[PDB]
Amino acid sequence: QVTDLRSELLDSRFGAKSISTIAESKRFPLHEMRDDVAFQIINDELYLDGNARQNLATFCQTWDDENVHKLMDLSINKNWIDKEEYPQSAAIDLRCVNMVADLWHAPAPKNGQAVGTNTIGSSEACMLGGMAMKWRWRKRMEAAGKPTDKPNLVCGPVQICWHKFARYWDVELREQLFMDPKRMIEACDENTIGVVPTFGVTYTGNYEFPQPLHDALDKFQADTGIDIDMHIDAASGGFLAPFVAPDIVWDFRLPRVKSISASGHKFGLAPLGCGWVIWRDEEALPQEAGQVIAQYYEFLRLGREGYTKVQNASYQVAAYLADEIAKLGPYEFICTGRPDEGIPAVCFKLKDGEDPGYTLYDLSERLRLRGWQVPAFTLGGEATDIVVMRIMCRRGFEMDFAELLLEDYKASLKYLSDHPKLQGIAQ
Amino acid sequence: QVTDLRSELLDSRFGAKSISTIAESKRFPLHEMRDDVAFQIINDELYLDGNARQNLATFCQTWDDENVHKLMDLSINKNWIDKEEYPQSAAIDLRCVNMVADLWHAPAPKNGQAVGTNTIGSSEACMLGGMAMKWRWRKRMEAAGKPTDKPNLVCGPVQICWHKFARYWDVELREQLFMDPKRMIEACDENTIGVVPTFGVTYTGNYEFPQPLHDALDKFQADTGIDIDMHIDAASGGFLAPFVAPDIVWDFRLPRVKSISASGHKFGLAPLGCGWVIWRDEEALPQEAGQVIAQYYEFLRLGREGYTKVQNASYQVAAYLADEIAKLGPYEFICTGRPDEGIPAVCFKLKDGEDPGYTLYDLSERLRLRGWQVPAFTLGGEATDIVVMRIMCRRGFEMDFAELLLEDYKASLKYLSDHPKLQGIAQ
Amino acid sequence: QVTDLRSELLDSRFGAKSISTIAESKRFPLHEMRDDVAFQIINDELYLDGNARQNLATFCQTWDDENVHKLMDLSINKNWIDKEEYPQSAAIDLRCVNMVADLWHAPAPKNGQAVGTNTIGSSEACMLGGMAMKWRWRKRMEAAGKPTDKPNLVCGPVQICWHKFARYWDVELREQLFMDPKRMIEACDENTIGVVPTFGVTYTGNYEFPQPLHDALDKFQADTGIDIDMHIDAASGGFLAPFVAPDIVWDFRLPRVKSISASGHKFGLAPLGCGWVIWRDEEALPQEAGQVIAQYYEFLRLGREGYTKVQNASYQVAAYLADEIAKLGPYEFICTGRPDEGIPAVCFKLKDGEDPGYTLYDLSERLRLRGWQVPAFTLGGEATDIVVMRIMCRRGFEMDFAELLLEDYKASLKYLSDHPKLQGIAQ
Amino acid sequence: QVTDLRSELLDSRFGAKSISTIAESKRFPLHEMRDDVAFQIINDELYLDGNARQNLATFCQTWDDENVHKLMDLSINKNWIDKEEYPQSAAIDLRCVNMVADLWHAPAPKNGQAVGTNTIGSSEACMLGGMAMKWRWRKRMEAAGKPTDKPNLVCGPVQICWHKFARYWDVELREQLFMDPKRMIEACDENTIGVVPTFGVTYTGNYEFPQPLHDALDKFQADTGIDIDMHIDAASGGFLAPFVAPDIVWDFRLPRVKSISASGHKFGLAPLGCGWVIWRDEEALPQEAGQVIAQYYEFLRLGREGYTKVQNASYQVAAYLADEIAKLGPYEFICTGRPDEGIPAVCFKLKDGEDPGYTLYDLSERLRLRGWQVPAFTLGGEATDIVVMRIMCRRGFEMDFAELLLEDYKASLKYLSDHPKLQGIAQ
């Protein structure tokens, strides 16, 4: 009892009885071990997790500066949930709502504060905008006096964050890289909740433009009685276009856009995982604390100048990888990465014509051997045997890193080329 | 341009031109300032926020050791969203699901992995369990074949996390510290989705015991044909009773308990803000990453030993404050803080008979002047003019701190004792 | 024994038996506890102490950069007591004595090393200079040869750091913000040790000028035989005026100024709490280590450039608060805060005419509710009818902080405006 | 202009124009340099200062643990000066006063708080006690009615911290290792202020015992009318004997002892430099904040157990060095270092008989060559050609260090022995 306790006292962390056992799992621990052994046994499995620096499949953030770290450390616990218990965090939250609703061109608020909402993620943002539009539609059309059972929410080919809404909220849904302006309201002639055109969302890489379709909305209000609003689902374009392509018009510069939704952890440099919903004016919405601190710090420290600089760095790397991989092999880029037209990413498939002995699928793993989490994919359609690869570029992926990735690319190209029987490594 | 730039280079933190302006607000910054001045600008706001250590109105956590700090530091970015991209975080997630669904006594899972779900908060947990049992009821009673427009979900007098459900999910809801076992199913005997009795909820203090009502459920199954299940809403109880009062019956030890909901940031020592939902087994449920890792670390480091020691410390200090403030003045404690009956908290009101020259509203202010966020309240009922105070105890509230609070209490007593006109300071 | 000691080893700091007791007080501890639990026990007391950042009643320093911090860390123990054990600390000490005796315009020392002395505080400085000039007077006037029992040291109405001297050093104490040049020596024309006119000491805020009175000393030398020297008690003006207002005559630029006394922790940016005494040259004086080094670091890092920037920032925010609170209510500022005339502070009182339903005593309370230690006072005179408030500004008090104080000021205005029965909350 | 500025921006600390000049001195810096260059130029001269670890001439502290360092760095600003602005530091101050006045055996205070005073150094303590007993001597004498012009304060032969008092406070002073009990009052039969016998003072190494002289005091009270009190000047015995020699009686266990003075930075493990004065009870005294935090932390963390352990470690090292150096050469230890008799130190001279070719003056410098600041001295008496050396032992001087010191001793012994012309290296 005493001697083994003494050994438990003064011992190397790799000499104790506490560690030589397997980790706990299927039951609750009956006793307590030393905190350093627990810390080590946890740290090792996240070592096994992988290297997130080279994970090019994600858009979420990777790096944060020291001051952001200190700020989130200061704000670990306290919440903005209610009013006075922590009064300044809610104030800063309303400040950032003001700043974002300014950046996306809102009408100047009369009383002095904009209308918006911070959210945990983009899904909550989309669901909020959805039931908001549903509420105003039902209210005014009941003012009209006709009954309801068949409300179709148009557009949104593969977005499921809204299909969950339409699947649970009693909503029918009926819907080039995008849909033409006419068929849009061909399916949306009379009855409709809302029109949701994406903007730099994860699945549709490059912008699905709102100016071409707004002319449609206007002239089919002029033609037939139905006047329908919109909601842009800008998961990233909401924090890219106002810096690197300001002229192109997608915000409340148009009349009929009533609400806009974005995520701040993709490209808003906000670490935790956050989202924003912004409404045009009090008339828009119906009847009815750590991430804000880091986002406000980023807003102050960087501003339009620094944000333009960082997003232009990312677009630069995207252009570089595009051109060089283009002269690597027989590729056909669907998504190149120009600031005017899409988010900084490169999605490309093998040439229509030929197979170079090796499928793209099996190049991804020869890259993985080095630690590059570069993903290959197939799209959802009538053709199911064309396969693409996407190398998303983000903050914290410097040009040097792109060069090392391209060198490992080259090495993989040589290995598969020589040993030709690696043609079908993927399922 | 050059001279003031040189001044910008080598300057004290409080001599720069960038600081002497007011903070940003109603618009987006056009340029970028230096990181140090932005860091300070933010830091003094959180200074003005208040002192969270002495904020006794909250139940959420306050302090976390260094190991959990660096561990969450390591896991800041990565998420449990899917299997491949970060494989071990989801593994540890399912591990903690096993741990919890063990701690609340579940049937041993056949394949080897328990059923459950981690969530962002207790609200999502409550909503999820509610929709789940709604699906169960609708599907099976439609296998019976009779129409459904009259679903009354009973119990839960002041919980709004479920009133939001019943407000949006087309659900009518019809409903001593608790209600007697007979009237319970009186309101419920025929049509009913579920019965939700709380357990250590934020407003209700005492355990609303499920054993007395379970015999009721059984014998009105035996009497009338309706067999109705249950769902415990154990926000704080779920992580207290299995350590400091194990014998008391409340989890799946009873047959009809189909699901349990808890919050892990209240008394589960999990920092971020988390929740747990746990289902009995596969038959129950319908057809259709930083919190887990720190909660797993605390599970391993403390276990049953450490957790019992901690919650018993909290119950200890809660008993101490009870007795001493009891013989300070003419008080009537409704919530004392015994481990058998309630969460570690002390809620007391004025004696029914008399007023000691001062309300308990104004005593909160004379406590506040030194930083004690002790909240006074009024209860919800037909009688409005009886006021209470709650001095909730938690981890990180050592006993000498309690004696300090009591000394400041004494000082406030003397002060508003001498100057008797401070009788109606609160609105 | 063995089990409880095992528990003593593996335990959270809030589960240990050692903490669950009250702190020690009325006796010496017989045994020893662990260092972490004592560290926590102490830390929570300083938590309860208050927030020194928002304590505007003090003039002493609040913040110091990391370099001076780790520097005083390196110098924690060593002493400037003598040359033999630590020879360079005394070297830097004599260096900064040179620096100061320069900054206040001394005659160039022949040997190359100025005369002076670093001290622990301003009180010891005042006593030292007083005893020095008393020795001078007694020795020379006994070289004249007439008896000495009637020494009246004039000026210094409310300074007690000199009245302690005059209390036990056998000195008679004889003595429109300041006194006119004639009555000054009216009280003094024959027998007198010295004339002590302050220079923005703690109690008298704005400069009591020595130029107007020096012509007095000169021509009552020319008229009657008595030649009297002086000693400025510049507790703050000694480290403010030579940067932000240099043209004024107040140091040894005048002939009869024999000594100067200042404090280095007020506006000299020296952390510990220090003082300086400086003598004209060797003839004046009678026959008979962490502060210096941090003050030397700040001298080198900032110099005239940095110090000017800093004190001008403080005067800036002091003017801001003046104008804003001036247009808040019906106030009459006695001390505004112009660099030419006073230290950076704003002392104001109620208008002579009317009371706005609330005294300025009770406004300090509703400011305190948020943490602002803004002190209200009563003046010292034959008339106890006026109450004042002083909002002293210092390094570390950014301007956005000032606007935050102003917003809380506004809130207090509204509150005690609506509820009028708060007429006399202060004793 | 611009190119040199960009060079000053991107540059090693040893490539800038700022460093190539020597440090500032005889004047105030006109401009500001970079703070890192200033920090470096300060750091290197402290390098040149010396190594305080091997400075065995001092008794003051050398090392403090991490927690005391963080407490002091937390309190580097706040003061105990006044009651409200920092209320808890003063509370802890009176706590430590209670604990010290308990440790030295005071009568139990009736109200509950002891009488005492914290001070900056020992000098202020001695001066305070002196003026206190002077005041009582005066008031009692006034009641008796005889004039006071010849007050002699006995004892204190080489202490100057009291001779300054007697030099400025109009006090005549008339006064084996100590003076016999009879001659003490032989110089003090009738007129006397006080009797000051040291205890652990720096100059008189080993205790000047109060029990032998107290019988004297009692029986010359019984013999002639004069009843005279005492004051122990225990600069180090005050924090030594109550742990390592409790039975010996020198505190208020005796009646006539009215006050006791000590320093807390020598052996009280208090870093800053502090002192304590303690009075018997209210009847004793006349009619008219960082150090305490660290001393209170030491009191709690260590207590009687830890303090006994550390002082016994120091006495152990003192015994070891004594025996070993006695084995080295022909030495005659005057101060050996036994716990019953004196402070932990070893003072020794050369044997009266012979010179071993080298004096101990010149052995100290051959020790210095390695870094050992071991000092040699001569005493003030009738024969001043005997020379001693003292190796004071303290906390932070472990046995290993004593062994290395002895080895360097041995090496130096050989060098002087061989080269015999090093007879008179000291002045």
DSSP letter string, C389-405: EE----TT--HHHHHHH
Quote the CA–CA distance of A360 and C194 in Å, as a whole number. 96
Quote the CA–CA distance of B166 and C264 in Å, as a whole number. 68
Quote the CA–CA distance of B387 and A128 in Å, as a whole number. 37
> Which chain C positions have a beta carbon within 8 Å of B11's beta carbon?
306, 309
> Which chain B positions have a beta carbon within 8 Å of D33's beta carbon?
10
Quote the CA–CA distance of B396 and B269 in Å, as a whole number. 11
> Going by DSSP bridges, is the β-strand pair A275-279/A257-263 parallel, antiparallel, or unpaired?
antiparallel
Backbone angles phi, psi at A350, to 5 degrees: -65, 155
Query: Which of A76, A91, A301 has the CB atom closest to B35's CB atom?
Result: A301
D1 touches chain B (CB under 8 A): yes
Residue with tokens 């056009």: B30
Whether residue C345 contacts residue C390, with contact meaning beta carbons closer than 8 Å, is answered with yes
The Cβ of residue B157 has, within 10 Å, a number of other Cβ atoms equal to 14
Whether residue B274 contacts residue B291, with contact meaning beta carbons closer than 8 Å, is answered with yes
B40 touches chain C (CB under 8 A): yes
> Which chain C positions have a beta carbon within 8 Å of A5's beta carbon?
2, 5-6, 9
**CB spacing of D31 vs C305 below 8 angstroms:** yes
> Which chain A positions have a beta carbon within 8 Å of B303's beta carbon?
28-33
Helix (H) or strand (E) holding C262: strand C257-263
A182-186: long-range contacts at Cβ-Cβ below 8 A with a sequence spacing of 24 or more?
A182/A216, A184/A154, A184/A155, A184/A213, A184/A216, A185/A154, A185/A216, A185/A217, A185/A220, A185/A228
The angle at the Cα of C369, spanning C365 to C375, to the nearest 5 degrees, equals: 40
D120, two tokens: 């900056």
Query: Which of B11, B51, B424 has the CB atom closest to C47's CB atom?
Result: B51
Whether residue A306 contacts residue B32, with contact meaning beta carbons closer than 8 Å, is answered with yes
Q: Order across the sheet with C387-390: list the strands.
A: C331-335, C347-350, C387-390, C376-378
> Which chain C positions have a beta carbon within 8 Å of D60's beta carbon?
77, 79
Residue A93 DSSP class: H
D240, two tokens: 């030594």
Whether residue B66 contacts residue B384, with contact meaning beta carbons closer than 8 Å, is answered with no
List, in order of start, the domains of chain B with CATH numbers. Answer: 1-66 (4.10.280.50), 67-307 (3.40.640.10)
Helix (H, G, I), strand (E, B) or coil at C184: helix
Quote the CA–CA distance of C249 and C241 in Å, as a whole number. 10
Nearest to B206 by CA among B166, B265, B248: B248
Backbone angles phi, psi at C96, to 5 degrees: -70, -25
Whether residue A35 contacts residue B67, with contact meaning beta carbons closer than 8 Å, is answered with yes
Could you tell me which residues come within 8 angstroms of residue A328 by beta carbon, excluding any fewer than 6 positions away? A406, A409, A410, A413
Quote the CA–CA distance of D75 and D73 in Å, as a whole number. 5
Where do the H-state alpha helices sit in C104-210?
Answer: 122-144, 163-168, 181-186
> Which chain D positions have a beta carbon within 8 Å of C67's beta carbon?
35-36, 38-39
Instruction: Give resolution, Å, one decimal.
Output: 3.6
C28 touches chain D (CB under 8 A): yes
D94 touches chain C (CB under 8 A): no
Quote the CA–CA distance of B224 and B218 in Å, as a whole number. 10
Sign of the CA dihedral running D238, D242, D248, D253: positive
* Residue A105 Ramachandran class (φ > 0 left, ψ -120 to 50 alpha, else beta): left
Where do the H-state alpha helices sit in C211-337?
Answer: 211-223, 241-244, 290-328
> Which chain C positions have a beta carbon within 8 Å of B13's beta carbon?
65
**CB spacing of C301 vs D36 below 8 angstroms:** no
Backbone angles phi, psi at C348, to 5 degrees: -135, 160
> Which chain C positions have a beta carbon within 8 Å of B22's beta carbon?
399-400, 403
A93, two tokens: 């939250």
Helix (H) or strand (E) holding D259: strand D257-263
Give the burial class of C291: count Cβ atoms within 10 A of its Cβ; 0-12 exposed, 13-18 middle, 19 or more buried. buried
Helix (H) or strand (E) holding D38: helix D35-49
The Cβ of residue B52 has, within 10 Å, a number of other Cβ atoms equal to 19
| Cα of B51 to nearest chain C Cα, Å | 8
Sign of the CA dihedral running B21, B23, B25, B29: positive
Could you tell me which residues come within 8 angstroms of residue B292 by beta carbon, excluding any fewer than 6 positions away? B80, B89, B92, B93, B96, B118, B274
Determine the distance from the C-alpha atom of residue D114 to the mean position of all C-alpha atoms in its chain, rounded to a whole number.
24
Q: Give chain B as a 3 state SS string.
A: CHHHHHHHHCCCCCCCCCCCCCCCCCCCCCCCCCHHHHHHHHHHHHHHHCCHHHCCCCCCCCCCCHHHHHHHHHCCCCCCCCCCCCHHHHHHHHHHHHHHHHHCCCCCCCCCCCCEEEECCHHHHHHHHHHHHHHHHHHHHHHHCCCCCCCECECCCCCHHHHHHHHHCCCECCCCCCCCHHHHHHCCCCCCCCECCECCCCCCCECCCHHHHHHHHHHHHHHCCCCCCEEEECCCHHHCHHHHCCCCCCCCCCCCEEEEEEECCCCCCCCCCCEEEEECCCCCCCCCCHHHHHHHHHHHHHHHHHHHHHHHHHHHHHHHHHHHHHCCCCEEEEECCCCCCECCCCEEEECCCCCCCCCHHHHHHHHHCCCCCCCEEECCCCCCCCEEEECCCCCCCCHHHHHHHHHHHHHHHHHHHHCCCCCCCCC
B421 touches chain C (CB under 8 A): yes
Helix (H, G, I), strand (E, B) or coil at C9: helix
Q: Order across the sheet with A257-263: list the strands.
A: A116-119, A275-279, A257-263, A230-233
Name residues 97-116 of chain C within 8 A of D (Cβ): 98-99, 102-103, 112
Quote the CA–CA distance of D202 and B278 in Å, as a whole number. 72
Helix (H, G, I), strand (E, B) or coil at A260: strand
Query: What are D231's strand-pairing partners?
Result: D259
**CB spacing of C12 vs B310 below 8 angstroms:** yes
Quote the CA–CA distance of B180 and B185 in Å, as a whole number. 9
**CB spacing of B14 vs C396 below 8 angstroms:** yes
| D abuts A (3+ Cβ pairs < 8 Å) | no
Whether residue C89 contacts residue C79, with contact meaning beta carbons closer than 8 Å, is answered with yes
B146 touches chain A (CB under 8 A): no
Quote the CA–CA distance of D288 and D276 in Å, as a whole number. 18
Quote the CA–CA distance of B39 and B45 in Å, as a whole number. 10
Query: Which of C46, C78, C304 has the CB atom closest to D49's CB atom?
Result: C78
Quote the CA–CA distance of D359 and D376 in Å, as a whole number. 10
- Experimental method of this PDB entry: cryo-EM
Nearest to D159 by CA among D122, D211, D190: D122
Could you tell me which residues come within 8 angstroms of residue A339 by beta carbon, excluding any fewer than 6 positions away? A244, A245, A311, A312, A315
| Cα of B106 to nearest chain C Cα, Å | 29
B19 touches chain C (CB under 8 A): yes
A34 touches chain C (CB under 8 A): yes
Determine the distance from the C-alpha atom of residue A286 to the mean position of all C-alpha atoms in its chain, rounded to a whole number.
27
> Going by DSSP bridges, is the β-strand pair A376-378/A387-390 parallel, antiparallel, or unpaired?
antiparallel
Give first-to-last CA distance, chain A, whole Å.
56
Name residues 310-369 of chain C within 8 A of D (Cβ): none
The Cβ of residue C251 has, within 10 Å, a number of other Cβ atoms equal to 22
Quote the CA–CA distance of C406 and C399 in Å, as a whole number. 10
Name the residue type at position A28.
F
> Which chain C positions have a beta carbon within 8 Å of D35's beta carbon?
65, 67, 301
Question: What separation in angstroms does the CA of D393 have from each of D56, D57, D60, D313?
Answer: 7, 9, 11, 10
| D abuts B (3+ Cβ pairs < 8 Å) | yes
Whether residue A100 contacts residue B30, with contact meaning beta carbons closer than 8 Å, is answered with no
Name the residue type at position D194.
G
| Cα of A36 to nearest chain B Cα, Å | 8
Whether residue C233 contacts residue C199, with contact meaning beta carbons closer than 8 Å, is answered with yes
Could you tell me which residues come within 8 angstroms of residue A2 by beta carbon, excluding any fewer than 6 positions away? C2
Determine the distance from the C-alpha atom of residue C231 to the mean position of all C-alpha atoms in its chain, rounded to a whole number.
17
**CB spacing of A5 vs C10 below 8 angstroms:** no
Helix (H) or strand (E) holding D164: helix D163-168
Nearest to B216 by CA among B204, B200, B227: B227
Backbone angles phi, psi at B68, to 5 degrees: -65, -35
C87 touches chain D (CB under 8 A): yes
Q: Which residue of B has its CA nearest to C427?
A: B419
Backbone angles phi, psi at C83, to 5 degrees: -65, -35
Q: Which residue of B has its CA nearest to D6?
A: B6
The angle at the Cα of A409, spanning A404 to A414, to the nearest 5 degrees, equals: 130
Quote the CA–CA distance of A324 and A326 in Å, as a whole number. 5
Helix (H, G, I), strand (E, B) or coil at D116: strand
Quote the CA–CA distance of A107 and A101 in Å, as a whole number. 9
Q: Which residue of B has its CA nearest to A124?
A: B124
Whether residue D265 contacts residue D125, with contact meaning beta carbons closer than 8 Å, is answered with no
Residue with tokens 């050692």: C18
Nearest to D114 by CA among D93, D89, D88: D93
Give first-to-last CA distance, chain C, whole Å.
56
A144 touches chain C (CB under 8 A): no
Query: What are D347's strand-pairing partners?
Result: D335, D390
| Cα of A92 to nearest chain C Cα, Å | 13
Residue C112 DSSP class: S
> Going by DSSP bridges, is the β-strand pair C347-350/C331-335 parallel, antiparallel, or unpaired?
antiparallel
Whether residue A195 contacts residue A184, with contact meaning beta carbons closer than 8 Å, is answered with yes
Query: Which of C51, C370, C398 has the CB atom closest to B19's CB atom?
Result: C398
> Which chain A positions have a beta carbon within 8 Å of B31's beta carbon?
303-305
Q: At what angle do helices D399-418 and D303-328 cross, to 10 degrees?
A: 20
Helix (H, G, I), strand (E, B) or coil at C222: helix
* Number of continuous H segments (helices) and E segments (strands) in chain C: 12, 8
| B abuts A (3+ Cβ pairs < 8 Å) | yes
**CB spacing of D87 vs C50 below 8 angstroms:** yes
Could you tell me which residues come within 8 angstroms of residue A320 by beta carbon, excluding any fewer than 6 positions away? A399, A402
Number of Cα atoms under 13 Å in the Cβ half of residue D329: 24
The Cβ of residue B406 has, within 10 Å, a number of other Cβ atoms equal to 16
The Cβ of residue A374 has, within 10 Å, a number of other Cβ atoms equal to 22
For chain A, what is the radius of gyration of the CA atoms?
26
